[PDB]
Amino acid sequence: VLPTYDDVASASERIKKFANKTPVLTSSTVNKEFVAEVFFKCENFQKMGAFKFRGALNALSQLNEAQRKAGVLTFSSGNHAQAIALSAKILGIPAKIIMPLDAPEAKVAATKGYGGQVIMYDRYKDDREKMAKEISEREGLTIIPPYDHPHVLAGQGTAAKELFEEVGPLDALFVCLGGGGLLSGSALAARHFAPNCEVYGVEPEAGNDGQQSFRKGSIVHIDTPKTIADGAQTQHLGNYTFSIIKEKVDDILTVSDEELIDCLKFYAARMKIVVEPTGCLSFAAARAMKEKLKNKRIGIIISGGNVDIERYAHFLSQ
Amino acid sequence: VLPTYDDVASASERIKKFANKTPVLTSSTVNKEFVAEVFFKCENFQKMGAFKFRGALNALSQLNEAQRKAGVLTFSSGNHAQAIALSAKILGIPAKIIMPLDAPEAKVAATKGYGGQVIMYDRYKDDREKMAKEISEREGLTIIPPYDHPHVLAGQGTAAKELFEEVGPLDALFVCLGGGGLLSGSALAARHFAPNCEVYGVEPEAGNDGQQSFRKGSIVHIDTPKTIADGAQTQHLGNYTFSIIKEKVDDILTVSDEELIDCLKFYAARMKIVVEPTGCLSFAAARAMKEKLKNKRIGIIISGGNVDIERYAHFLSQ
Numbered sequence: 001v002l003p004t005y006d007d008v009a010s011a012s013e014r015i016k017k018f019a020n021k022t023p024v025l026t027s028s029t030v031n032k033e034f035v036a037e038v039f040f041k042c043e044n045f046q047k048m049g050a051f052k053f054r055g056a057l058n059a060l061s062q063l064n065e066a067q068r069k070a071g072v073l074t075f076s077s078g079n080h081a082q083a084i085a086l087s088a089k090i091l092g093i094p095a096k097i098i099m100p101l102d103a104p105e106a107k108v109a110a111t112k113g114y115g116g117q118v119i120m121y122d123r124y125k126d127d128r129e130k131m132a133k134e135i136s137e138r139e140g141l142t143i144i145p146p147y148d149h150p151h152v153l154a155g156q157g158t159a160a161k162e163l164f165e166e167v168g169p170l171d172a173l174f175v176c177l178g179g180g181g182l183l184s185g186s187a188l189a190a191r192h193f194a195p196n197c198e199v200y201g202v203e204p205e206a207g208n209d210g211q212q213s214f215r216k217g218s219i220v221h222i223d224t225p226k227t228i229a230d231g232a233q234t235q236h237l238g239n240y241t242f243s244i245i246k247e248k249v250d251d252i253l254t255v256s257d258e259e260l261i262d263c264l265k266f267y268a269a270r271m272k273i274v275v276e277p278t279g280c281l282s283f284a285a286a287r288a289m290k291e292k293l294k295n296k297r298i299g300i301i302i303s304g305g306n307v308d309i310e311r312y313a314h315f316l317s318q
Numbered sequence: 319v320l321p322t323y324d325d326v327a328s329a330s331e332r333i334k335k336f337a338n339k340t341p342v343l344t345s346s347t348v349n350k351e352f353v354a355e356v357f358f359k360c361e362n363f364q365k366m367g368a369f370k371f372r373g374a375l376n377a378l379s380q381l382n383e384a385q386r387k388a389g390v391l392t393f394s395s396g397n398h399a400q401a402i403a404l405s406a407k408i409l410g411i412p413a414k415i416i417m418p419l420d421a422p423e424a425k426v427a428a429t430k431g432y433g434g435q436v437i438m439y440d441r442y443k444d445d446r447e448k449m450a451k452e453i454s455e456r457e458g459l460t461i462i463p464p465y466d467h468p469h470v471l472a473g474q475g476t477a478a479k480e481l482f483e484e485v486g487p488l489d490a491l492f493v494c495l496g497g498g499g500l501l502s503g504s505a506l507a508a509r510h511f512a513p514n515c516e517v518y519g520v521e522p523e524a525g526n527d528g529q530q531s532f533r534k535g536s537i538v539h540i541d542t543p544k545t546i547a548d549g550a551q552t553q554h555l556g557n558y559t560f561s562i563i564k565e566k567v568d569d570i571l572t573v574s575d576e577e578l579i580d581c582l583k584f585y586a587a588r589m590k591i592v593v594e595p596t597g598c599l600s601f602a603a604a605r606a607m608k609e610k611l612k613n614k615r616i617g618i619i620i621s622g623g624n625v626d627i628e629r630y631a632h633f634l635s636q
């Protein structure tokens with residue numbers, strides 16, 4: 001049932017033709033403050049702006065003939081929707097995207113630019129799931145989970161795979177945590193390339209269901225948390241993702257929005273890169289324990305840079 | 319008198335130990351709109367945030383023993399000041415930096431972080447040059463020109479050198495233009511690596527003294543131009559830089575602030591990178607003629623990303 005590093009390896013092969021082997025950035029400013037060597041895997045530079053492109057492409061690249069012709073459908077309010085839309089376009093698969101009537105104009109335009117057929121719903125009614133079921137069952141459309149899927153998580157893991165192949169062994173790896181696709185895929189990669197590398201997942205303190213699950217040994221559900229980390233407002237971990245996280249992740253950490261904001265500002269002012277709030281979870285945690293990272297080689301996964309410009313300007317002004 | 323490609327080559331060797339071999343980014347979105355292949359040399363990822371680090375280091379690496387011990391002094395309101403400060407620190411040379419009393423806090427903090435000794439003056443009186451002469455002559459401090467210097471321009475040219483070495487021949491190269499250090503150094507590199515590459519300098523339309531000089535065959539002086547391109551408000555080209563530009567640059571183009579703003583927004587929203595207004599001059603021009611760049615391989619020099627956060631947020635909200 002559970003994917004292994006071999007699936008991450010095969011995913012690298014499947015996506016090689018379309019995915020970006022994103023650059024790894026370093027900062028003399030960061031290295032100084034940490035008294036270590038930090039390596040940033042920039043998935044904000046990934047096709048469509050987030051790491052999710054990897055898992056979306058890996059999953060769509062394996063649908064059967066009937067599904068390819070019928071098409072796919074998404075209703076997620078996060079990066080998965082655009083990851084699926086772009087992946088579908090690249091693979092010649094029709095894609096319908098359910099979005100709120102008040103969705104950011106730039107996001108709607110981007111989705112249409114990805115060939116996605118936009119279907120809107122009223123945000124106040126929040127009829128998303130109902131609509132997704134009705135449309136998908138009637139039209140034979142396939143819905144790919146944003147994280148709880150073997151193909152999706154294996155694909156997300158290729159970012160870490162690339163990081164290790166480029167910089168070599170790492171003593172610590174920090175990864176953003178929502179549903180757990182990125183973390184589980186990254187853990188598979190880390191355990192293979194660096195058995196002794198400490199792997200950490202990071203959640204917003206207001207939504208530490210992943211942390212609670214890790215402690216309890218069972219998946220814990222919570223009400224949608226209020227936090228600026230819009231991509232980590234997950235209510236619970238996935239079955240596949242948690243099964244791997246529980247076995248291959250060393251610990252789950254949490255950071256405050258205040259910390260996410262300082263990190264977002266730092267990325268902009270010191271490293272000159274645009275990172276969405278949720279994509280700051282990993283570095284914020286690392287900074288929070290820079291004292292325990294002495295002279296180690298540390299990997300930071302920058303998950304994405306898809307933040308509404310107005311919102312970005314807002315946080316930068318905080 | 320004039321530096322040649324050989325000086326750019328030797329500069330690469332002098333700075334190799336401290337400068338960043340900045341990454342080259344590409345965009346499927348840009349390639350589509352241009353119907354070509356575009357390559358972005360990211361000097362916003364250079365040490366200190368701008369390409370000037372290269373020329374500063376090349377010049378300071380060649381001062382005599384007396385000058386190294388006495389120190390250097392800068393009074394420029396742009397990136398050159400911090401380029402000199404950081405380069406001086408790295409080379410064990412004292413550096414005094416003259417800044418306005420109302421200089422951006424983050425910039426002052428950065429300069430101090432670079433070991434620079436800050437000296438302030440009143441912005442309304444603008445006593446900068448007077449002070450710089452008085453202090454430098456009394457203390458035996460050396461002042462390095464921000465662009466009109468053989469060592470400075472040769473160093474700036476290594477960015478283009480690196481671009482050509484990484485991506486190979488290019489049909490067109492777009493470079494930002496202020497005093498002409500970047501352009502002249504880049505032209506030297508371009509003529510060597512790609513004899514047939516069209517080299518273009520780009521200025522803000524309000525300050526097209528470089529364009530006028532190129533047309534006239536003589537250096538033209540203008541009053542400080544009003545434009546958001548704070549790093550290209552130069553009143554005239556340098557003697558060394560113009561001498562090279564006149565012989566090795568194909569043409570000088572100009573863009574409006576409106577175009578710079580759209581470019582700054584695009585870099586943030588589509589490529590996820592922070593670029594200061596002046597650093598958008600090169601891409602803005604390229605877009606303005608994307609139709610004449612058919613199926614070519616085009617190089618874009620992103621000169622820097624040092625823009626006050628508040629100012630950056632402001633432009634992003636436009």
Ligand SMILES: *Cc1c(COP(=O)(O)O)cnc(C)c1O
Pocket residue numbers: 050051052078079080146147156176177178179180181182183231232234276278279303304305
């Ligand atoms: C989806 C997403 C996450 C969370 O990833 P999961 O696999 O759900 O844990 C984090 N950051 C960004 C930018 C995302 O798009």
Ligand SMILES: *Cc1c(COP(=O)(O)O)cnc(C)c1O
Pocket residue numbers: 368369370396397398464465474494495496497498499500501549550552594596597621622623
């Ligand atoms: C200094 C500077 C320029 C202009 O370079 P010159 O060598 O004066 O032509 C352009 N962009 C940035 C970001 C700069 O710092």
Ligand SMILES: [Mg+2]
Pocket residue numbers: 177178203204207208209210232233234
């Ligand atoms: Mg959570």
Ligand SMILES: [Mg+2]
Pocket residue numbers: 495496521522525526527528550551552
């Ligand atoms: Mg000018």
